[PDB]
Each structure stands twice: as structure tokens, then as C-alpha cells.
Design a protein around this ligand. Sequence first.
Ligand code: UX6
Ligand code: UX6
Ligand code: UX6
Ligand code: UX6
Lengths: 261, 261, 261, 261
Amino acid sequence: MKYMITSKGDEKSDLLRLNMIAGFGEYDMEYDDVEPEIVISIGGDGTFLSAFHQYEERLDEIAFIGIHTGHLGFYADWRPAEADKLVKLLAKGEYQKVSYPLLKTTVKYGKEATYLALNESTVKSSGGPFVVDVVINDIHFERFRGDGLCMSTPSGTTAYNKSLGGALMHPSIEAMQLTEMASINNRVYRTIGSPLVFPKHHVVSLQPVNDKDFQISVDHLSILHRDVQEIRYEVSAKKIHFARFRSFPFWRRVHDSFIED
Amino acid sequence: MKYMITSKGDEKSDLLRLNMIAGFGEYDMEYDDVEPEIVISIGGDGTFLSAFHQYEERLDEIAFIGIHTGHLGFYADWRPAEADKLVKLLAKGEYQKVSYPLLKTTVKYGKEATYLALNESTVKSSGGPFVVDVVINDIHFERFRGDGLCMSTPSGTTAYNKSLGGALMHPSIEAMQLTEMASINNRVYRTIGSPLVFPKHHVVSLQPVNDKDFQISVDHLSILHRDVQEIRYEVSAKKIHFARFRSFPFWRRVHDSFIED
Amino acid sequence: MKYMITSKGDEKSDLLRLNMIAGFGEYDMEYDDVEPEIVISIGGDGTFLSAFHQYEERLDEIAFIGIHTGHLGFYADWRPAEADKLVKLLAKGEYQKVSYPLLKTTVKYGKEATYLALNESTVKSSGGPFVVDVVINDIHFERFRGDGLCMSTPSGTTAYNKSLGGALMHPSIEAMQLTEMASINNRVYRTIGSPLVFPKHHVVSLQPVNDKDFQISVDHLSILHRDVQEIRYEVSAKKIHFARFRSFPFWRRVHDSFIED
Amino acid sequence: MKYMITSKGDEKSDLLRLNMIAGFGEYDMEYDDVEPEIVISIGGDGTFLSAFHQYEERLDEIAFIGIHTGHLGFYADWRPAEADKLVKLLAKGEYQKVSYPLLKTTVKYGKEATYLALNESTVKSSGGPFVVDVVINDIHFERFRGDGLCMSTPSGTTAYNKSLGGALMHPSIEAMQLTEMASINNRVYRTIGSPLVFPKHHVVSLQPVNDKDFQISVDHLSILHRDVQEIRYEVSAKKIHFARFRSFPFWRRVHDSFIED
Ligand SMILES: N=C(N)NCCCC(=O)NC[C@H]1O[C@@H](n2c(C#CCOC[C@H]3O[C@@H](n4cnc5c(N)ncnc54)[C@H](O)[C@@H]3O)nc3c(N)ncnc32)[C@H](O)[C@@H]1O
Ligand SMILES: N=C(N)NCCCC(=O)NC[C@H]1O[C@@H](n2c(C#CCOC[C@H]3O[C@@H](n4cnc5c(N)ncnc54)[C@H](O)[C@@H]3O)nc3c(N)ncnc32)[C@H](O)[C@@H]1O
Ligand SMILES: N=C(N)NCCCC(=O)NC[C@H]1O[C@@H](n2c(C#CCOC[C@H]3O[C@@H](n4cnc5c(N)ncnc54)[C@H](O)[C@@H]3O)nc3c(N)ncnc32)[C@H](O)[C@@H]1O
Ligand SMILES: N=C(N)NCCCC(=O)NC[C@H]1O[C@@H](n2c(C#CCOC[C@H]3O[C@@H](n4cnc5c(N)ncnc54)[C@H](O)[C@@H]3O)nc3c(N)ncnc32)[C@H](O)[C@@H]1O
């Protein structure tokens, strides 16, 4: 069907893309980057994340594939030398689809803006100290003082979440995980410290205490938000779909990326 | 219906139990510790854990309640001065039931023994170094060298799991979480370090490397197991049921126990 | 002798300062904020840190004292109600002096700028990723990829260093401690993770890999440094001196601030 | 002068030892394992630790050397193929000596026993819960509830201390570092969590709360101590001396063992 291919833009990826386009020319495949049904990403995880956000308005109509021209990536988990066998099976179709949960972030002002995350959404201060009240399903849980907070998808747990001490969870779990960045804990200031894993339909709301300017990042994209009244986190109703052509279990991908490959 | 009450055995709990039995005498309540339908625990979380294991053969036929005569416990989350209003509503019935996932541990020899955990199951060595191969759904993930491992239920994440850096997850998530104890990591020895959260139907299997003697604990109960061939972890098909009479949200219980009450 | 007093600038501290000045008027004490020999700070640890940097050019000629009008601070460890007994003993003199090690940071360009730290010096990126080579006594130790790094004095170990997992060390140890902020560790990227404690006369040098812009902070003061060629850390030859009038042991101060007071 | 050589006892180490003895036969070297002046250890760090404890009664009269027949060890940091050049220079003498601080542990009963540690001394309970009061220079600092505690030498910081989150410190620092094992922290139970680094002449004393039986380990050696009244930790007046024949800086050894070699 309709398909498009993004490239990291180096010599290796551009050339692989042109060779795959030539392979797709031999089948009933039409190149369309407006309404594709298959999005292939050649590069790294950033390149894949860029591709997801390019088509986040059509997630239910697209199956993603990532090719890693550098090291093994978590989302780009197929090798460049296997690009031909990829072109073949993708042209025949009859593949299976694999869905991962996504994360919704809502920012209210004094207006509303929402964002979809594949890895995580983080919050930091514009420059001053970062103080925010953390409210869970309208229950005030803590007042966080520190550098910032990170709300991660399941597949994102191996990313920024991992460096902050968070747990790695399997993407079949529809959940989201909040981790701390350098919280200050003493006699007066008290946070939980432990990461928190929230189920679907739970709402985690951050509410300012003094300064209302916050550096909010969604994957690679970071934006300064002024006069913030509330940041809301919840597991999205939408999901990203992966075209799978063979078994590459999550824990196997985790073993190869962190233990030994 | 039929009910029984366990006591920590101090003066405070024994007396509260006798006073509740007297209150139940005023209703159509029969004391039966053989086949109760309501199990009340007066004491601490250990007292509650002891009560769960006393009736783990009838979990589907029992709703548990815990009264804390000392500090607030996670499972014993109702106060002694509220014991009368508890007796009333329990006698009328028409309460709601709240299920938490449990953890199944299977130990094979060279025979098989299984155990149900409400908090966690841990593994340590008999005395020598602790080396074990960690296999996830028949995929070899790592070779753990360290002090031991902890596999925790959701409700157990606030217990031993919390002191080992694990995440706290909400008990509506049917999952289990593995955390490390003092793993040795260098150029030759490599573990993941991060906690791992596993969904239902996933099997985590520990397999010995040299010594086959292991100190295996299930909640408060610890047993030396000799000639161990395999320890298997998976989320149980069985669940513990709590009789709830009002909203005491998990994150509220977490706030009170760790932040401030 | 000559003395001055800084104030946090709220009603409480300003009034305490005016009352202490009146008490000093009754003795052979001359107020001089140009060349004082005693610097008193009324407020918090920030107020004390501001006072240290106001006179970092005369550290060998000044003994510091801090009064905490809010909670107990580590540097401001004397209470407002004890201000009179402080005025008395300070006027008589014959006190003991207590020295804490300081931290020297040197920034080279393509020129040189140096800074003295009482708590810590940190490095972060201007906006892009933070990659820096860490060289210890001209030996290349690692290539750090992460959010940033923190080099802490002994007395600073209870401050930012504490929130980053660093050890708390006693200020009689002439040393400095480096801790990580959210390092990325995988098959390709490898840092030590553990905090590092360096003795006197050791030089730790950070060297850029790509981007040469870095947000460098020294205590409360943060400055964007462009075209950075090198950041050098070493234990200063200079020391801050505290006027002590009674035993307030470091570990006692640590107990009161973090365990219970 | 007088010398002896210990062996791990495998084929590789035994044969290297016999070949070095033959090399020493060609010089004015007499084999004496009663009063040696040079102790060579062929094997791993355990083999080296065993050798240190074999002659802990003559530390001031002995310079140690370790050869690693397996992977690089921290104490055994010279390779088997370099054994000949080692024999030569050792026979000529005129080497430099390098001292590392040691750790003294004193156990009182209701009698006294002391031990010297090269890596660390740890405390765990005999079987029940581990509760101990931690007193620093006669000041009560905390009541530790958890799995156990670890008091480490500087050179030991890369060993068990490293797996418990402790900092790695350079052995020219005469100090000792205490780290926690799975402390329980909640509203009622409070420990510092952070590692603590203590200078020379500081005394850290552990004092029982209920059960007085403790599993105390000093390096590889673990002993059950009954009716314990006090465990005291302080930096030893004694030091281990290493015969050095070239520069192998501590941080270089750390880089090779943990980053890449
Ligand atoms: N956030 C910005 N713009 N700057 C920080 C750049 C840090 C960096 O070197 N990230 C790339 C690496 O992460 C891997 N990766 C990715 C990716 C990617 C592209 O980056 C953006 C992402 O980064 C993460 N990041 C940000 N800051 C840190 C930090 N301090 N430490 C660790 N990660 C960090 C964050 O997640 C963000 O989205 N996706 C993964 C996943 N799902 N699983 C496992 N590896 C995964 C990928 O292969 C590669 O090895
Ligand atoms: N494992 C044995 N026999 N000895 C260790 C005793 C350590 C201890 O003081 N535990 C009781 C405390 O935990 C709380 N608790 C409980 C409980 C209980 C009864 O204990 C047995 C349990 O302990 C846990 N434990 C064992 N070792 C450690 C350790 N080193 N650090 C922290 N906990 C530990 C482990 O989980 C075990 O099952 N259940 C909780 C939950 N679900 N959520 C949050 N608090 C919870 C409870 O109120 C009380 O404050
Ligand atoms: N860095 C800026 N401008 N913004 C961050 C502000 C974070 C904050 O609430 N710090 C004040 C608290 O630290 C205590 N403190 C101080 C102090 C102070 C004044 O602040 C500046 C200092 O902060 C530290 N800081 C920065 N970021 C973090 C973070 N994420 N987490 C924890 N601390 C942080 C850093 O050290 C800096 O110098 N000095 C201490 C010491 N020597 N010992 C133990 N407490 C100490 C003091 O009582 C008070 O309870
Ligand atoms: N404690 C007993 N009997 N059983 C635990 C055995 C754990 C183990 O595999 N240790 C050997 C490794 O440590 C390295 N090592 C040594 C050594 C050695 C001989 O062991 C005894 C030592 O172990 C340490 N140990 C005990 N338990 C743990 C644990 N859970 N995690 C990590 N280490 C542990 C402890 O320190 C003890 O003394 N000395 C080092 C140093 N100075 N620097 C850096 N590496 C060093 C050595 O090369 C080798 O790679």
C-alpha cells in the first residue's frame, strides 16, 4: 500500500532509502508521505521518534518500522543488511501489528495544549527553583522540590527513565511511570523518592507553587511554557502500531542493548 | 456469615478481639476459624500476612480486613477506635470486594513445591556466593552475581521492594517486579541493575550455576531449599480479596505511610 | 574588632541585625563591611553562601558565623534567641576557629577564570546534549554522557551532592567529590556511576567533545560559558574559617537536619 | 631478602609460582614463609586477601605484590607474562613502597576481639531482624533497621562498598566509609541513606537493640558472634605496604576494571 521512508540524512541512510524505494518500485507500492500506511525510519531512535511525531495525527492508520544504520536502537530494531527481506515481506503484507501504549500530556494556561509521547514527558523550571505540587486523582501526594520530573511510557522506561533509577516495564502493560530528578529531602522537604507506576485511567497532575514557567519536553522536543496552571499526565487512548515480521521479544532487545550483543 | 479474628497476641489486640466477638454475638454472625468468610486481623502487617497464609487455601471464599493496633499498616488500614462501626457494617454485609494480584513461586528439585506470596519472594545463597542464571520466557537474560533477588507483588512494592530501589506500582496492575540486592558489576560481571516489571503470563526462571542450595523466603517465612533445579516466578491466577467499606486509595495509603500522616 | 552583618532582608532578620548592632555598640566593636574580621549572616544557607562570596577575597582575615531565622541550616547553625550570648562572647573574643576545605574551579577559553565554591560547582549543557571527557591527573577516565556533573566540597556533600547519591564526608577531610546527573549507560556508553572522592593535589579536568557551551554554577551563581576549552577541579589552597563558641559536631548537625530534631 | 609466594592452587598459578621460585634461586633470595619480607600472591583478589590475613601480624615488615592469573584484580595488578621482570627488580630491590589505610573492628562481649580489614567489615543478623543503634563519637546518630551495614577501607570502596552505592575514594585518604543494605524507611523508621565517610580518629560504634547475635564478616571471613555488646569501627593505625615497580594509578586501575581495558 502507501508508504514513506524517513532518513537520518547521512550518506549511509540516504543510500539505503533510495535502494529500498527502488525495491518497492518492483511491487504494487506507491510512495506517499501524505497518507502512508507504512512508515519506515532509517537511522537511530531519534530518527524514529521524529517519524512518530511526523504522523502522530494518523497513528491508527500507520504501522511503523525502524532500521538502525548505527547501533541497535530500541525502536529501530532491524539491520540494514536485512533491508531487502524487509521490502519483500512488507510488499506481500499479511504481517502482524504490535501496539505500545502512549502518554498524553495536557498543559493548561490562563487555554490548553496536549502532546503525545512515545518515550517520556519531563518538566523542569525556566531557571529558578523547581517546586510543584503532585496530585494523584485529585489527592495531594507530595510537594516536589528538585531538578525536575519524568513521566515515561512503558517503552520509554529503557530511555531517560532508566537513567533516573526507574524500573523497566514490558510494553504490554498499559501504564506510565514517574521518576524524580535530584529531589531535596530533609526534615522540612519530603518526597517519595521511589518511582511510581500508574495504571490506565489514573490522572497525575502537577500544579505550580510559585513560579509558573516550566521547560516541558516531549521526547526530543522541549518548549518553554509560561503561565502554566496545570500539567496533566495520563495514559493515552491512542497507541503506536509496529509492523512485526519475526519474534524480537522486549526482554531480548533489553538484553542486547544493555547486557551484551 | 462465618468469620474469625486473629490477634497479634499483645494485651491491646487480644482485648479488641474479645470486644469485637462480643459485638458480633449481637448479630447473625457465627465464629468459625475452619471455614470463615471474613478474616479480621488485629495487629500489624506481619499479623495480616500470617492471617493470609493461614487461609491461602480458601482465598476465593474469604474477604480480609486488617485493624492496626500499632502504626498504620498497608494491609491493616483501619483504626482500633473504628472497630464498632466495622462490626456493624460487616454484619449487615453488602460491602464491596477489592482484589490484589498475588505471586506464585515454584521450586523444582531432583519433585516440586509452590508458594503464594502477598508481599514478595526472595532468594539468597545458603552461605557461599550467590550466582544464578535469570531466564525470561526461556530467553537467557543475565547471570546474576550478588546477594540475592526479590520478586514482589504490586502491593508488596511498598515493602522490601521499596528498600531495594524498586518502583511502587498500583495493585490494579496485574504484574510482578524483580529487584537486585548488591549486584557485582564490573568488566566481566554484568547485570541490568534496573528493576524489571513483568506482566501476567510471563515466566521468570532462576537456574543455579554452581551451588544449588538457596535460602528462599515467602513473606515472613524463610526456608533452606537443597538441590534446587529451578525457581519459577509468575503472577498467580489466584487473588486476595479485601472487604472495603470506604475509599482509602492506594496512593493515599502511600502518602500517609511515607510522606506525612 | 571590625565586623559586619548581612540579612536575608525579611522583617525577622533585619530586626535581629539592628538589635545585634545595638549590642555591639556597647563593646569595642566597630561596624565595617569593607574590611571586617567577623562576618555574621542572618537568614538561611543561601544568605550565608551570599556572605561567603561577598568576602571570598579576604577569607584568611575573616571568621564567619551564621544565624538561622528559619529552619536549621548547615552553615547558619545558631538560633535567633541565642543572639545576645553570641554578641557577648564575640566581643570578648578568645574564640576558636574551624576551617573547612574549599573547591577551586578554573575555566579556560580561546583566557582563564577561577571560582571558589563552598558547596559545589556543577556543569550542564547550554541546551544540546552534554558530552564531556573526564580526565584525572592527565589520565582519560571516561566520556560522560548525561545531564551534568557536580563537584562538591566536604561541607557541600549534604547539599546538592546528597540528592545525587553522593556520600556525606566530614569536613576535616581535605577532598572533593564528583557525582553524576542521569548518565546514559548502555552497550556503547559507559560511565563509572559511583561517586568519586578525590584527595588534595589531584586535578580533575573536563574537556568538551562537541559543543563547547556549558552552564557552570558555583553555589547559587550560574553563568553560561562559551567556547570552553577546559574546566579544572581541585581542592583549593584557601579555606573558610568559622568562629565556634561551643561543640556542634558535624554528625550532630547531620542528625538534626536529616534524621530528627 | 626473605620472601614467600602463595598460589590460588590451580594449574596456572602453581606452575607460575614454581617458575618464580626457580628465578629467585638465581639471586640472593631465601624462601621463608615464616618471616618473609616480600609476599607475592598469584591468583585473584581473594588469594591476595588470604595472603594479607596470613601475615597481618607482620604488616610493617612486609611489602605485598599480587599477580593476576585470571582477570585484572585491584590488589593483584601485575600480569603473569611479566613475572620474570618482576623477579629481577624484586631481587635488586631499591623499590618504592605504597601504603593503604586499613580498618580496625573491635567486638566486645559479656571480653574483646579485634580484626583488621583490607576491603571491608560487614554486620548482619543471625536470622531475625537486624536492628542496631549507630553512635558516632558517642553521639547517637540513628537506629538502623535493614539487612546490614558495611564499613569499607578506601581500597575496599571498589569492592562490596561499590555495589551498595558507596563512593569510590582514593587510598591516600585515611578514612572509612559506611554504607547501608536495604534500610527500611517510613514514617516511623528513619536512616540517613547516604553513605558516610569518616576520618581518622573517629569512632563509629554499633550497639544492639534486641537480639545480640550478629554475622560479622571481615573480607572473606564471616563469623557468628553471640552476646555482642558493641561493634566499634575506626581507621587502623597499621597500614598495608605494596612494593611498586611502576606507575599504575588508582584511577587507571579503576578505569580498566569498570570502564574498559
Ligand atoms: N533529550 C535530548 N534531545 N537530549 C538528550 C540526548 C541523550 C541521548 O544520547 N539519547 C539518545 C540515546 O537514547 C537511546 N534511546 C532512545 C532515544 C533517543 C533520542 O534522544 C532523545 C531521548 O533521549 C533520552 N534522554 C534524554 N536525556 C537523557 C539522559 N540524561 N540520559 C538518558 N537518556 C536521556 C530521552 O528518553 C529522549 O526521549 N529511545 C530509547 C528507548 N525508548 N529505549 C532505550 N534507549 C532509547 C538511543 O538509542 C540513543 O542511544
Ligand atoms: N522479613 C522478615 N521476617 N524480617 C524483616 C523485617 C523488616 C520489617 O521491619 N518489616 C516490617 C515493616 O514492614 C511493613 N510492611 C509489611 C510488613 C511486614 C512484616 O514483615 C515481613 C516483611 O518485611 C519486609 N522486609 C524484609 N526485609 C526488609 C528490609 N530489609 N527492608 C524493608 N522491608 C523488609 C518484607 O516485605 C516482608 O514481607 N508489609 C508491607 C507492605 N506491603 N507495604 C508496606 N510496608 C509493609 C510493616 O508495616 C512494618 O513497618
Ligand atoms: N541552586 C539554586 N540556586 N537553586 C536550587 C535551590 C534548592 C534548594 O532548596 N536549596 C536550599 C536548601 O539547601 C540547604 N543547603 C544549602 C543551601 C543553599 C542555598 O541554595 C543553593 C544550594 O542549593 C543546592 N541545590 C541545588 N539544586 C539542588 C537540588 N536539586 N537538590 C538539592 N540541593 C540542591 C546546592 O548545593 C546550592 O549550592 N547548603 C547546604 C549544605 N551545605 N548542606 C546541607 N544543606 C544545605 C538549605 O538549608 C535549604 O534547605
Ligand atoms: N564475601 C564473600 N566471600 N562472597 C562474595 C563474593 C563476591 C565476589 O564475586 N567477589 C570477588 C570479586 O570482587 C573483586 N574484588 C575483591 C575481592 C575479592 C574476594 O571476594 C571477597 C570480597 O567480595 C566482596 N563482596 C562480597 N559480597 C559482594 C557483593 N554482593 N557484591 C560485590 N562484592 C561483594 C567483598 O568486598 C569481599 O571482601 N576485592 C576488590 C577490591 N578491593 N576492589 C575491587 N574489586 C575487588 C574480585 O576481583 C572479584 O571480581
